[PDB]
Symmetry: D2
Subunit: 376 residues, 4 copies
Amino acid sequence: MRISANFDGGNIETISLANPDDIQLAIRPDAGGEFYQWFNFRFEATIGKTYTLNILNAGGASYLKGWEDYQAVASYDRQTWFRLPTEYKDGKLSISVELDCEAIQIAYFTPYSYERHLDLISAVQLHPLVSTEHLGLTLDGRDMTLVKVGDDDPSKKSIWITARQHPGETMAEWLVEGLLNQLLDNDCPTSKALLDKANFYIVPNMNPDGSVRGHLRTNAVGANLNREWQTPSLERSPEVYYVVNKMHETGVDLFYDVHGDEGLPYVFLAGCEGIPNYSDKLASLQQDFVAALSLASADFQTEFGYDKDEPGKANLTVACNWVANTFKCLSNTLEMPFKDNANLADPFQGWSPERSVYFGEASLIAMRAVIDKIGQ
Amino acid sequence: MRISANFDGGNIETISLANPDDIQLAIRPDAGGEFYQWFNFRFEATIGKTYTLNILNAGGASYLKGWEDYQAVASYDRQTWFRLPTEYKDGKLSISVELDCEAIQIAYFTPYSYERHLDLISAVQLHPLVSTEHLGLTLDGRDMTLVKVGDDDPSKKSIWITARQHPGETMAEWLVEGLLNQLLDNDCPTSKALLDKANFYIVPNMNPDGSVRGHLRTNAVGANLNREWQTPSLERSPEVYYVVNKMHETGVDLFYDVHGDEGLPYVFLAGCEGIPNYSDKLASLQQDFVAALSLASADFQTEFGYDKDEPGKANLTVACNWVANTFKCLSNTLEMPFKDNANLADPFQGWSPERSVYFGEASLIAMRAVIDKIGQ
Amino acid sequence: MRISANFDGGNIETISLANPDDIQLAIRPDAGGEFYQWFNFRFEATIGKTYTLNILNAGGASYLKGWEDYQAVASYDRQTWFRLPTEYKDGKLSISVELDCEAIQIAYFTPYSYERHLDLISAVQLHPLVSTEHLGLTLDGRDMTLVKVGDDDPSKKSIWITARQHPGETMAEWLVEGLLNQLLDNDCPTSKALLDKANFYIVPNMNPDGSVRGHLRTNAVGANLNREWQTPSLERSPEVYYVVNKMHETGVDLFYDVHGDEGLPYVFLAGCEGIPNYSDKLASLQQDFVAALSLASADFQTEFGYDKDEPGKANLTVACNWVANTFKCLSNTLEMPFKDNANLADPFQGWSPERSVYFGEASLIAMRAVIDKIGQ
Amino acid sequence: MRISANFDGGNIETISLANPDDIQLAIRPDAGGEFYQWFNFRFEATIGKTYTLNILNAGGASYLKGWEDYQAVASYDRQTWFRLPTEYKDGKLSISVELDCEAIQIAYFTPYSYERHLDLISAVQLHPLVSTEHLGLTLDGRDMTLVKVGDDDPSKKSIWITARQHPGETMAEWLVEGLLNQLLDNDCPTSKALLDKANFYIVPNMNPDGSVRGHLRTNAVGANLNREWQTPSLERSPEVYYVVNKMHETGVDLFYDVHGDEGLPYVFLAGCEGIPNYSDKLASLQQDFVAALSLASADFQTEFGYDKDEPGKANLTVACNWVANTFKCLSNTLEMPFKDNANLADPFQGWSPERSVYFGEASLIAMRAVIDKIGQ
Ligand SMILES: [Ca+2]
Ligand SMILES: [Ca+2]
Ligand SMILES: [Ca+2]
Ligand SMILES: [Ca+2]
């Protein structure tokens, strides 16, 4: 029996490997010690036995609702990631592994490596309408890379799409890969139509450091990038600092910040209704966008989500709000579940990279729906 | 220099191969002599020369608007089909071939073989929710095959999708392949949602005989299958006869007859407003369907199309009308262009199998939009 | 219960579909009535039941040993082909089919349609060292296409590879497909080494008409092409006529005639030792070539095959002898089994396209082994 | 202008990005400071301009002949890797880069990341004859994974294949990738023939720590693993320690140690003729094996390589000698070039992963050639 986590995005501590029926494990907290929930490790043992893996400190994780009805994600081949029988009792998350192969990787969601990220931002370069741009360095010295899709025609609209501010929400980068694959297909009319009218500025990974470090919610020094938008710094939140400045060069006509929510088994938008600069026009663009997104995706819904902000009561340090209020534009945070969409449940895989990719495609349709309405 | 057409879907007659600057060719009429326009042949010559291929009887084709601004489709590898410089003057369609390889296939649209059809209806079988059904024989003795997708739960709605009644409109089968590939993907929520609520009855090729025979508009004996719907026969229109009877077993809650239009460079729906049984409900389902389809596809439009029928003035021998009137359901004919979509023009390839496939996907979204509204 | 053979390569006649425990069929003879063995048909019935299909005229097939230990080939998806439980007694070949899907295709070997042929000879054109050449028409008016691989440097050695003189021997064209794929990959050193020294003249299908017609062994007018090499004609055997004349333009340094054998469950070469121009030099090349092939491929063997010809007693109407005798060169007929390689049995699929593809690859290694020894 | 190496396998130090005509860099030494040559970095600048990149400490690299006629490897998409114009004078290696895309990755050979390693050893698990076995941890805490191919029948012969003891020699793991793919294809007869007679013990990466760290030649603590075979330890060389102990459990009948050579532009084997247990029998197997390899692969040659050891004078701390001497078996070191195969030059890419994959395939043929001759 073996457990391991020394690789890109790994996160587990081994407490005890003595008992096959009680393998004891712990999640390692994000830097700064204030958050955790993401785990990602590899387990090797004799096949044909059923093992119980106990994450002892699940009860100390940042979002305990996220453990309720949750099933761990696992893969034998690192290609197909499926769900495992999981339960949460006495502060511990118990995972049953009926090992069909010697080696299995188990994680909070399907991982997305820095090697994969590098392949994605390198490959999109070949497209004639694509140019990548080095925004700057992360605190560990990794690259903040901007994918610009379009012909930089100043008359076109500006669409900003940021994903993975919270590194453990890997479904965010997965969606951005799906969306890029569809946008970069000229045979797709939505893509052609969009690119005829807009330039895209896309950041597939807002937080490479937290990503490689196996953090749930913070960068290298423990900053929550989604509170850094109003007063970002090079010292603490360079990741947001460069994005914010670029936005000032480009303008923003539509903003889509892609996230993952631990506790709620639904896909939902959370808008910026509480910003001081909210308006009837913005209200109206939101209704149109939500209308379009519901038609575009059967995974989308509007019953469950976060509470709305009272008027003027928005937290202007949050990307969605800060962008909306600063650039007076349609702006949303998208949340996809770590669990599954309870409305269209899939017990074999729950929410998955495949469904995140489909939501990336549905997203471009919602955008096209409002393309002629956004901007000036 | 050589010209050839003896293969599945081939259609050309060689008048003269004497002059490289004036290769003379003719389209062979459908059986019964009343229609033609489709051509499909192979041409071999010395590379690096530019040849002029003249289809002498273009002026005698069934739809002369279809020659205006039309460019022939061609391929070196039978995978990527592109457009050739083409002109229509003095009743002849002139195609310039700057031969980059020894062998090129040139056709009215991308062909879709019976071998390809057999692969498609064989492959879908592997899906757990798919069963194919032999409806009967065509007049040449080929197979009319029905693809049933779903679990045959009698409480579910019935969706009928028929394509390629007119064999030369190959874009119809191409769309049906795209649509099946998307419908049979469980990761797609639209697919899951649809199949939760409906059973699909799909005929990827209404006219195998006309298809293999290289006809534009008719089956083996020259019948136009889209006038056979009210009084079909085994002797003359077995293809429609078996479909019509099956419909009586299944019911129809939505009908989608997939077609191609020669003269108009637009995608458009043609509905059944002129049926005696038209109603406010049917009017309303049509508006919803059209609304959804416009949001789903940037290739769709609603300005151009056919003229609407005066009330009660529908031709009830046409599938769209006959089905709508008989089963009192949302029913449409879809027309995709042999030219290109003038709104999102693509000079390298015009309308293509790739775009037809995308329209198949957009179609499932339009359907889902009305899934809860159709039926009783 | 339905039986059908109306499609490219189809061959069966239905005697009786009355009894599911005794479906009665017969193999249609080749044009000329002299031969048969090849069959290919589609069967549709009810899944979950086991049907017995009896080819009542198997006892009159051309090679009766071909029936002993033979198992029929089948596919539900037309991509994976596998063996069905088969027995031969009292002149009847009995195939058991427990239908998992409604439709299944059953054949003597995996079919290779003309549409596939067209895809192959078209696709290879894109390679910068490939040119196709139209040799002329078949009797039914289809193409005899020569695939030329190399820089056409007339100083180089000439390698001729011909497959499928007997149409039912589809494995031969599967092998050429595999040989071309590898030969066209420049990262393969054997490929690079060969093209530096030789030009290739490859005919993936010697008998397109026999192929489409579902014949075992003859072209459209009942000619056995492999007895036409000495005195062919445009009116009986144009297929051979054009190749013989091209060989005279190009010369021949190595000849490989790809065939399939019904009776022996082994892979073997048959040489041309009986030709009047046989020489020590030729016998030496043959041993070099056989050794190399034994090393290149574990499926090859040299214990079983055809008896050798006595000195001078070869039939010069057979390609291998005629070529060897005319061009004084290394020349073999390759025979692959319809059954399996008894030495490396595979019950699920027996001999297959994939194994044929691998043997194509091994053939290039054998050829490379004699590349500097051949020619002049 | 940006230079970066913070990623798996990264290696460069930036001296000066002041002048685009003289970008100044240096190669970081391996832990221990004794060796270097491997480099790997990403460069972002402005497209359309030609930049010169000068590695100023090339003159202190471990193998200076490695620089003569060497051309650097690069990629814009991280899928296709090609050679850049390079020269070496006055101790500096000068790379010319005319940037077509903004970002390019430049390396000594095509990188092979640990994430890719994990994909490989995970994917192969799905094969029914493959088991992975965790041998233990590396010094940095990564996995030493043994890939076992076969039915584990202890009566069979034992074939051991080890690659990438020197981390920078990535071609070795590319070769194992290609060898595994082919070995796991049951339609390949050599594969089938081998697994009927042998079990395989394959280590695709002998030095994961050196690999992630961007080392040429040493593990995490500066150890040259290929001098550790006689007296390894858990604390300096656990990588070799676990393999040596496993070999003692399994026995060894054929050993293949996969390496890359900096200096010679050729593929060659280095045997173990200097071992005290050398025998006529071993010399015979070696000639059989060399002959077979010469036949299997046109990239192989036997004129150039390392000088041979005198009788008895081999260094038994080197794997090939230690194994040959300990198990009295056929044993070779394979060396592939960083440059190219001077005998089959390819300017666009020189020696490459794809050629390495092909050589993996050729290696199975060579092994098959001695399969019944080896063992006991
Ligand atoms: Ca988040
Ligand atoms: Ca039509
Ligand atoms: Ca034959
Ligand atoms: Ca080495």
